[PDB]
Scaffold this active site. Structure first.
Site, PDB file in Angstrom:
ATOM      1  N   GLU A   1      -6.778 -10.009  10.013  1.00 42.25           N
ATOM      2  CA  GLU A   1      -6.568  -9.454  11.344  1.00 42.25           C
ATOM      3  C   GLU A   1      -7.712  -8.531  11.751  1.00 42.25           C
ATOM      4  O   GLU A   1      -8.030  -8.436  12.943  1.00 42.25           O
ATOM      5  CB  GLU A   1      -5.219  -8.749  11.425  1.00 42.25           C
ATOM      6  CG  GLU A   1      -4.003  -9.613  11.050  1.00 42.25           C
ATOM      7  CD  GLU A   1      -3.812 -10.882  11.889  1.00 42.25           C
ATOM      8  OE1 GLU A   1      -4.721 -11.309  12.652  1.00 42.25           O
ATOM      9  OE2 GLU A   1      -2.714 -11.469  11.771  1.00 42.25           O
TER      10      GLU A   1
ATOM     11  N   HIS B   1     -10.366 -11.001  12.902  1.00 37.60           N
ATOM     12  CA  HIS B   1     -10.119 -11.534  14.235  1.00 37.60           C
ATOM     13  C   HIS B   1     -10.397 -10.494  15.322  1.00 37.60           C
ATOM     14  O   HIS B   1     -10.812 -10.856  16.428  1.00 37.60           O
ATOM     15  CB  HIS B   1      -8.674 -12.009  14.358  1.00 37.60           C
ATOM     16  CG  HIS B   1      -8.260 -13.017  13.329  1.00 37.60           C
ATOM     17  ND1 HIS B   1      -6.940 -13.337  13.097  1.00 37.60           N
ATOM     18  CD2 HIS B   1      -8.986 -13.777  12.475  1.00 37.60           C
ATOM     19  CE1 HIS B   1      -6.871 -14.255  12.150  1.00 37.60           C
ATOM     20  NE2 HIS B   1      -8.098 -14.536  11.753  1.00 37.60           N
TER      21      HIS B   1
ATOM     22  N   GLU C   1      -4.624 -18.404  10.303  1.00 40.34           N
ATOM     23  CA  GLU C   1      -3.227 -18.244  10.698  1.00 40.34           C
ATOM     24  C   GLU C   1      -2.290 -19.016   9.790  1.00 40.34           C
ATOM     25  O   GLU C   1      -1.125 -18.632   9.622  1.00 40.34           O
ATOM     26  CB  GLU C   1      -3.031 -18.722  12.138  1.00 40.34           C
ATOM     27  CG  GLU C   1      -1.929 -18.004  12.838  1.00 40.34           C
ATOM     28  CD  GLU C   1      -2.294 -16.553  13.024  1.00 40.34           C
ATOM     29  OE1 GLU C   1      -3.148 -16.265  13.893  1.00 40.34           O
ATOM     30  OE2 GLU C   1      -1.772 -15.716  12.261  1.00 40.34           O
TER      31      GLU C   1
ATOM     32  N   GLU D   1       2.934 -15.771  15.296  1.00 34.76           N
ATOM     33  CA  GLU D   1       1.931 -16.621  14.675  1.00 34.76           C
ATOM     34  C   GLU D   1       2.349 -18.082  14.719  1.00 34.76           C
ATOM     35  O   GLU D   1       1.557 -18.944  15.115  1.00 34.76           O
ATOM     36  CB  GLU D   1       1.668 -16.158  13.237  1.00 34.76           C
ATOM     37  CG  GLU D   1       1.139 -14.723  13.170  1.00 34.76           C
ATOM     38  CD  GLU D   1       0.961 -14.219  11.763  1.00 34.76           C
ATOM     39  OE1 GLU D   1       1.815 -14.534  10.895  1.00 34.76           O
ATOM     40  OE2 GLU D   1      -0.035 -13.502  11.526  1.00 34.76           O
TER      41      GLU D   1
ATOM     42  N   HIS E   1      -1.149 -16.943   7.120  1.00 37.06           N
ATOM     43  CA  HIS E   1      -0.289 -15.868   7.603  1.00 37.06           C
ATOM     44  C   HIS E   1       1.166 -16.315   7.695  1.00 37.06           C
ATOM     45  O   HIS E   1       2.063 -15.669   7.134  1.00 37.06           O
ATOM     46  CB  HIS E   1      -0.795 -15.364   8.959  1.00 37.06           C
ATOM     47  CG  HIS E   1      -2.131 -14.691   8.886  1.00 37.06           C
ATOM     48  ND1 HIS E   1      -2.714 -14.065   9.965  1.00 37.06           N
ATOM     49  CD2 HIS E   1      -2.996 -14.546   7.853  1.00 37.06           C
ATOM     50  CE1 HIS E   1      -3.879 -13.558   9.603  1.00 37.06           C
ATOM     51  NE2 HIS E   1      -4.076 -13.843   8.328  1.00 37.06           N
TER      52      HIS E   1
ATOM     53  N   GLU F   1      -4.706  -8.881  17.923  1.00 47.36           N
ATOM     54  CA  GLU F   1      -5.268  -8.919  16.577  1.00 47.36           C
ATOM     55  C   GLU F   1      -5.289  -7.535  15.944  1.00 47.36           C
ATOM     56  O   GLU F   1      -4.963  -7.375  14.762  1.00 47.36           O
ATOM     57  CB  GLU F   1      -6.682  -9.492  16.632  1.00 47.36           C
ATOM     58  CG  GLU F   1      -6.800 -10.831  17.388  1.00 47.36           C
ATOM     59  CD  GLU F   1      -6.190 -11.991  16.597  1.00 47.36           C
ATOM     60  OE1 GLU F   1      -5.830 -11.780  15.420  1.00 47.36           O
ATOM     61  OE2 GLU F   1      -6.083 -13.114  17.147  1.00 47.36           O
TER      62      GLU F   1
HETATM   63 FE   LIG Z   1      -2.125 -13.576  12.064  1.00 49.43          FE
HETATM   64 FE   LIG Z   2      -4.889 -12.841  13.931  1.00 44.83          FE
END
Ligand SMILES: [Fe+3]
Ligand SMILES: [Fe+3]
Lengths: 168, 515, 130, 392, 392, 74, 130
Positions: free
Chosen positions: B133, B136, B232, B198, B235, B103
């Protein structure tokens, strides 16, 4: 062999004593370039301080950088390498160098040697990073041309390794 | 005028400012990425979620309030923090802190995607990703922080950011979802971080694992990790947009398949053996065989829904896939040999498979019993768990010709005389240095790019040093200064101390000295 | 049935699994027309599962499969999965924008996007297809 | 039914809970329950902010402060380290020392901004219902606010994007958090200016919230010529991430940015009857002070006073300040040309009023930044240099 | 150890969890899972606001809309019922019909106000650091704002306390919630005004945040004489809870309150360089519009158009409006004497400016309240009645 | 003046506002309760928790978020 | 101190023995007690407060303190007074923690409860009478 402790050892202490004796920008500059040519990268001259060279490099950088601020005019910090060369000229020279390289093997050594010679604090940070990205662009492109084109046995010949063992 | 105005209640929805974001950029000569890339095609794309900063914050904060309500209020009042099976509570020391660095590196890689994006909407997306990020990183840290407060063994939950540096499994973690993202082509992060990392590996790593946590009594990690993965979906939507731009322009598409196979191999090389080992050996109750989890998430779903569908557009099934499927079946069992053999270098307490475990391993991987099973049972006979035994299996491997090698590229341990996973040892000398590579894909990477791969391995740093000294120097001790964090059993008695390790006389060799 | 978590090879164990796992045909990826959507279990999500995806959702797409994975719902379907936050807000009786629906939407194997108040995960490769 | 097993939860299933309880020891295996207890606390007690953030970055001992060892596992083609000392001119004994005085990890950051997000929309729904826009000076609203405040969003947007390479390059966790929260706050500022414009368009027929005119003004109007040149340089001309953060927040935004946002648009809103703009500038100015708190800690407490490299760092910071203060004085000299377009208000838009506004900005900046790094500055000289751009 | 049993949790204890699982049926015993499914929804589907609030009040069938039966269990000495029809003149077919269009049960109400609470303190910490008070007109700050804005807190406080008997006496749950939320919003207004004064006191030496001068002005200054007479009457002179709410929010506060808060203090702040006050009036005006939404629903949708008692309710609402509008134009006539003390600003504080401010207040109110209950009002006539108090 | 000001970061805590609440009431003839009571003694007392409206909302919202997180999520 | 136990005195007896004392003539009027009782709603923050404040310095200053585990809450009884400083708690938790944040989880209070700055206390004293 028996390695000393990781973060505190006689090799590091001995090199800090060598470093402490640098007293000018020219002297520390030849010191750091010679060190970087001798001890860093896969084309280094010696692996004898392998687990300590990175820390030792940081300490030379610290010595050179303080010598720079104590001794050099501000304009020099922005526009010149501590070799005395013009920083922009250094950029142009090595971008041209790598763009004229005929093979990934030529280009990789040009990039690696540029960093050995001009890694900050030798060259000003902004000029170095821009130059280093420009060179890495070229080296990446040529390396990623036909990446899987050469069999492993040919790649090993081209790299010039001495093959000590291949598991059956 | 001063009297007449429409007084209907109106605000401004996020969609309404978002349509103006593309106009926020402006043209000047220096407006281009600072980072080296091979990819210079047009990339003026629209982001699929209409997120602005205020809404980003509202969205994420609403997630957090629910999550921290569940942790600080509900699960604490239930005492859930100590309702975890010890194997699994020990596994979360590793999984949460290792993921934490993935992360953390993803912040930096997403900043590279932010920097190399040219469309303001994609810069907008990657900013939110960069923030996610960070979220996380603090979520993974919160898991270990919570375990530190409520679980029966805080040691190693409470200091992994220094104690991970002792052991060899952490080296390869700094590549798999870390150096392998941020140290290279910036727009190629749309391929390695996103389309592989991811889109493929977070699903088992972050979601599937919550079922194993739950099975083993941990309701902390489902609470956090599932929230993590909700981010995610935004992402990968960013990364897909770029992948399209790459696919569409012929000069960029000629790099994509090589970058994809390299990223697939780089991530799976570590992910496959290490996560499978943590799932199957770091649990009491198993959800399903690791290799089925991998088959379902990696090969069939990611492989078919992302790669196979992109096959229509010239994206190739990774040439390394066959080697990877062999890893999915055996490599985590191979790694368990190294993990258990070298247990003093970690920060978690391990548990040899019990009789129930072993039957499960043999039922689901026939041949386990006659290979791994017999080894683990001999180690137990020799006193693997007993601090008075003077026995550490690493010395036992060497005395039977089972050397451990570190892959110069992936840092993944390799025991060629015992491995059933993919691999063969190649040892090269180059400029006075010996190097051990372990598979065709990483060997090519090192042969072409030696200056990217100078990672010192544990044997080079620790050569000639005794085990307890390395551990003490790296702070691998509980608060009493002598009892190891790492343990070869999960019981509350007969914990190993530095003196117990010292009696075994384990000194690190040079595994390539024989070549 | 083909969209079940334990579909196909996943039914086999021991040697039978290994034989199909290492069969030659299965050393390359096989294109799939499926999407996979993971929903984080919660009060609002469980309502969405029972009254949307398993009713109107499955009625429009009979191929959807919902499996209970303890902390989350695992949903696989042919072609696409769609969830309308406006419809979900009507079930829940509280403010519920598409951003609020995303609070508990995790894994998405397929192309995810939002259009107004609807969230869709689709097999289509937008910008490449159509 | 379903194809896969319905996994039984160990927390609640009797058989698995009994098995777990038998395996869990009746006593803790250590007493040290403080997550990352070894962090050196900045304040009287270790904070959760520090526990969650400090040493997440896996730096080795050859990047000052790192607890790890060895080379990175993978580097750039050429040999550029994943993180490295080459990334900046500044040096320190420990890159981890930085502490945001607001102690923002991710959760408190989005918590605070969520409050502003929801309350903004409630305020707008009620402001539109209030009809309070009826008393705003229409010339200010249409010719100055819409056009030149809109144009200011591009300065905020440029400063936001200046952080992209900082988020990749910077060398510690607390610095990376400080940088990224600052970047979101900058792009928030730009989106909020555009939100206000879109909002006025709903209340004022004929009012055009399109960014076409603001963009034309930012890119070609001489009033923003110096500002745009400075933002382009800070964002795209350099990669030293300390220089970006310092030039961006501590020189340019603390002088030009503070003048434009606070002395011009916020202050003059309250002489032209603008009951709306103060609600938006309240956010940008709050974010400025929060960002300043963290920027100040990084450059003053940590780098300008680092026991070994303080004076060394002040040499560079003095050089950057000299360069970017000249740039910012030029940006303000151009910007005060805007006063020739506003309706005159004594003490606000005449020469005495603009002179005092520049004395606040340059005086404040001397106290807040220049005095703390040893940068000498004649405030009156800088005020007078800008007033040369003022048309009487 | 401990003296009492450490009770085993049925959720997690293996033995008790197995006993519970064996006792729980394998199937639901009904399919109706909608909490109070029988409430008639105001909107397309039943809201959580309605489910949580509606029919909490246990009214019997002889209080219109009640679902219970029989007399109360205990009544007042004399026989006054716990709740009863004697509490108000207004009649309706169902006291439960009212719906706050903001759908505020307790949680969303404190959620929103918590956001405002935390963000205010961050804004003040940044505003003090910003130094933005330096450009406020000192006469406005010291002679008008401190003294007469401070004095206005007693109008807000009086209206807050007007709700005390309403919270006891009113006849349904959703009405009680809007009443109490409106009451907290008024005392919040009063506390926020005092908060602003205390805050300026920290920034301006010699500035006295004591309520002594504001209280003396509220209680004796002829400028607030009409206003104080009205809130005293609404607060303590009446107990019909519908009369309190209607006179309080729909007449007095919608005319005098909106003029003082929005046309005087908020509007003039933005002609006298006051960058602080708009942040506080932004809250009182947001609260006004939220309160108005619920008050409008109670008196317009529910009572003025009750299918059986609409015209009957308008007869009383017309009588109340006539009386309390007279009270409020008198309060405004007193209040516009304050303009004789302010620095003159064309279009704001001259006769034309105050006239347009009164046209907005009375014009808006005619649309927002009078037109909806059939109350005839000549706006120009009321403007002129107030302008008689304006000193040219 | 217009140049010099104390720029130390300050806010206003709830007890700073609370100390002035007693002064918010004012004297008039009809300022007494509406309800019948037997208890007419003086009752000018101080409350033991210095709560204002903003702080009231903040504390209760804090409790709520934790409670509803436990319910709706965990 | 055993007299502040939840099951103290008559609460130890069962059956007829309990009935005999419960209905004893002397136990038909209240008896003045110098104790206080404080209930802390279990949470991460309160549990830290119990172990490291009331059961450490708390019982150091007041040895009569009894803390009992009542599943969802802590039951505290002591002679004279119980005291909890929100600032000491916030130092322990490393996050902002005023007396109002401390009160998030302070429930039942049998005694005279009040706050003085950062400190919460519940006392047997009759403030305004004593
Ligand atoms: Fe990510
Ligand atoms: Fe992440």
């Amino acid at each position: 062999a028996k390695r000393e402790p990781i973060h505190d050892n006689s090799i590091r202490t001995e090199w800090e004593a060598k470093i402490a004796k640098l007293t000018s920008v020219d002297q520390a500059t030849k010191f750091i370039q010679d060190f970087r040519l001798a001890y860093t990268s896969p084309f280094r001259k010696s692996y004898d301080i392998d687990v300590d060279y990175q820390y030792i490099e940081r300490k030379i950088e610290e010595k050179l950088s303080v010598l720079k601020t104590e001794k050099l005019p501000v304009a020099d910090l922005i526009t010149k390498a501590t070799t005395g060369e013009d920083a922009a000229a250094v950029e142009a020279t090595w971008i041209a160098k790598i763009k004229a390289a005929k093979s990934k093997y030529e280009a990789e050594r040009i990039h690696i040697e540029f960093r050995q010679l001009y890694k900050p604090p030798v060259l000003p940070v902004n000029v170095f990073l821009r130059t280093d990205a420009a060179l890495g662009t070229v080296l990446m492109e040529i390396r990623n041309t036909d990446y899987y084109g050469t069999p492993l046995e040919g790649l090993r010949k081209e790299r010039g390794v001495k093959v000590l063992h291949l598991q059956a | 005028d001063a009297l007449k105005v429409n007084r209907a209640p109106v605000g401004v929805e996020p969609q309404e400012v978002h349509k103006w974001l593309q106009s926020f950029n402006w043209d000047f000569k220096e407006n281009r990425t600072k980072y080296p890339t091979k990819y210079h095609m047009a990339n003026e794309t629209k982001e699929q979620f209409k997120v602005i900063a205020k809404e980003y914050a509202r969205m994420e904060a609403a997630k957090d309030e629910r999550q921290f309500g569940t942790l600080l209020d509900g699960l604490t009042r239930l005492g859930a923090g100590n309702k975890v099976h010890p194997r699994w509570g020990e596994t979360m020391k590793v999984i949460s802190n290792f993921l934490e660095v993935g992360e953390y590196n993803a912040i930096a890689a997403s900043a590279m995607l932010w920097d190399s994006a040219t469309a303001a909407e994609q810069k907008n997306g990657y900013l939110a990703q960069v923030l996610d990020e960070i979220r996380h990183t603090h979520q993974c840290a919160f898991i270990n922080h919570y375990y530190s407060k409520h679980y029966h063994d805080p040691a190693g939950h409470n200091d992994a950011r220094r104690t991970r540096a002792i052991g060899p499994l952490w080296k390869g973690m700094k590549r798999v979802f870390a150096d392998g993202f941020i140290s290279g082509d910036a727009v190629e992060c749309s391929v390695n971080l996103q389309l592989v990392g991811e889109a493929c590996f977070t699903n088992p790593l972050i979601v599937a694992v919550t079922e194993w946590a739950s099975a083993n009594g941990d309701e902390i990690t489902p609470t956090v990790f599932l929230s993590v993965e909700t981010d995610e979906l935004r992402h990968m939507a960013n990364g897909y947009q770029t992948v399209v731009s790459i696919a569409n322009d012929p000069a960029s598409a000629k790099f994509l398949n090589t970058d994809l196979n390299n990223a697939f191999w780089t991530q799976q090389k570590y992910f496959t053996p290490v996560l499978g080992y943590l799932f199957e050996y770091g649990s009491k109750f198993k959800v399903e065989p690791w290799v089925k989890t991998w088959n379902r998430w990696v090969y069939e779903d990611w492989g078919g829904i992302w790669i196979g569908r992109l096959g229509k557009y010239g994206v190739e099934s990774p040439a390394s896939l066959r080697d990877a499927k062999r890893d999915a079946y055996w490599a985590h069992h191979d790694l368990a040999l190294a993990a258990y053999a070298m247990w003093p270098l970690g920060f978690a307490r391990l548990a040899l498979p019990d009789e129930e475990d072993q039957a499960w391993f043999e039922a689901n991987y026939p041949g386990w019993a006659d290979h791994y099973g017999k080894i683990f049972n001999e180690w137990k006979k020799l006193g693997y768990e007993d601090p008075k035994s003077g026995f550490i299996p690493y010395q036992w491997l060497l005395a039977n010709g089972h050397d451990v090698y570190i892959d110069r590229v992936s840092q993944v341990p390799f025991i060629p005389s015992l491995a059933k996973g993919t691999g063969s040892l190649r040892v090269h000398e180059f400029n006075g240095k010996k190097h051990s590579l372990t598979d065709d894909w990483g060997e090519r990477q090192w042969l072409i790019e030696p200056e990217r791969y100078e990672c010192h391995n544990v044997f080079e740093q620790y050569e000639g040093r005794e085990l307890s000294e390395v551990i003490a120097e790296g702070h691998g001790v509980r608060s009493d200064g002598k009892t190891l964090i790492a343990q070869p059993h999960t019981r509350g008695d007969n914990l190993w101390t530095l003196e117990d390790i010292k009696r075994a006389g384990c000194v690190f060799p040079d595994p390539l000295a024989k070549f | 049935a083909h969209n079940a978590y334990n579909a196909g090879i996943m039914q086999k164990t021991g040697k039978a699994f290994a034989d199909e796992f290492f069969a030659e045909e299965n050393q390359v990826v096989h294109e799939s027309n499926a999407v996979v959507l993971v929903l984080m279990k919660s009060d609002e999500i469980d309502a969405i599962i029972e009254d949307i995806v398993l009713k109107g959702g499955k009625a429009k797409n009979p191929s959807i499969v919902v499996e209970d994975k303890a902390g989350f719902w695992w949903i696989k379907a042919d072609g696409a999965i769609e969830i309308d936050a406006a419809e979900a807000g009507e079930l829940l009786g509280k403010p519920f924008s598409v951003y609020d629906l995303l609070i508990n939407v995790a894994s998405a194997v397929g192309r995810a996007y939002t259009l107004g108040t609807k969230f869709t995960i689709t097999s289509e490769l937008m910008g490449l297809d159509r | 039914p379903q194809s896969s097993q319905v996994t039984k939860r160990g927390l609640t299933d009797p058989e698995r809970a009994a098995i777990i309880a038998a395996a869990v020891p009746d006593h803790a295996l250590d007493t040290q329950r403080k997550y990352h207890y070894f962090i050196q606390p900045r304040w009287k007690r270790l904070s959760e902010y520090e526990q969650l953030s400090c040493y997440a970055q896996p730096n080795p001992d050859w990047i000052a402060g790192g607890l790890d060892w060895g080379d990175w596992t993978q580097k750039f083609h050429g040999g550029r380290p994943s993180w490295g000392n080459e990334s900046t001119e500044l040096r320190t004994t420990d890159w981890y020392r930085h502490r945001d005085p607001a102690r923002r990890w991710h959760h408190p950051y989005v918590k605070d901004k969520s409050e502003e997000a929801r309350y903004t929309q409630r305020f707008l729904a009620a402001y539109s219902s209030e009809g309070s826009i009826r008393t705003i000076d229409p010339y200010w609203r249409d010719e100055i606010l819409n056009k030149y405040f809109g144009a200011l969003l591009y300065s905020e947007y440029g400063l936001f994007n200046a952080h992209s390479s900082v988020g990749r390059d910077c060398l510690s966790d607390t610095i990376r958090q400080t940088a990224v929260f600052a970047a979101l706050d900058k792009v928030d500022n730009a989106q909020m200016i555009q939100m206000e414009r879109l909002f006025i368009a709903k209340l004022v027929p004929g009012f055009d919230a399109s960014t076409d005119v603001p963009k034309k003004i930012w890119t070609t109007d001489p009033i923003y010529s110096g500002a745009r040149a400075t933002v382009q340089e800070i964002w795209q001309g350099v990669q030293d991430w300390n220089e970006i953060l310092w030039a961006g927040h501590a020189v340019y935004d603390a002088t030009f940015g503070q003048f434009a946002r606070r002395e011009f648009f916020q202050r003059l809103a309250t002489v032209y009857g603008d009951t709306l703009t103060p609600f938006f500038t309240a956010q940008s100015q709050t974010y400025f002070q929060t960002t300043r708190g963290a920027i100040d800690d990084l450059f003053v407490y940590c780098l300008a006073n680092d026991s070994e490299f303080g004076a060394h760092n002040r040499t560079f910071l003095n050089a950057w300040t000299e360069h970017y203060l000249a740039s910012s004085v030029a940006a303000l000299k151009d910007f005060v040309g805007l006063y020739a377009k506003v309706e005159k208000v004594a003490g606000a838009t005449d020469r005495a009023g603009v002179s005092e506004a520049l004395q606040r900005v340059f005086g404040d900046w001397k106290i807040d930044y220049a005095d703390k790094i040893g940068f000498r500055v004649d405030v009156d000289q800088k005020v007078d240099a800008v007033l040369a751009g003022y048309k009487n």
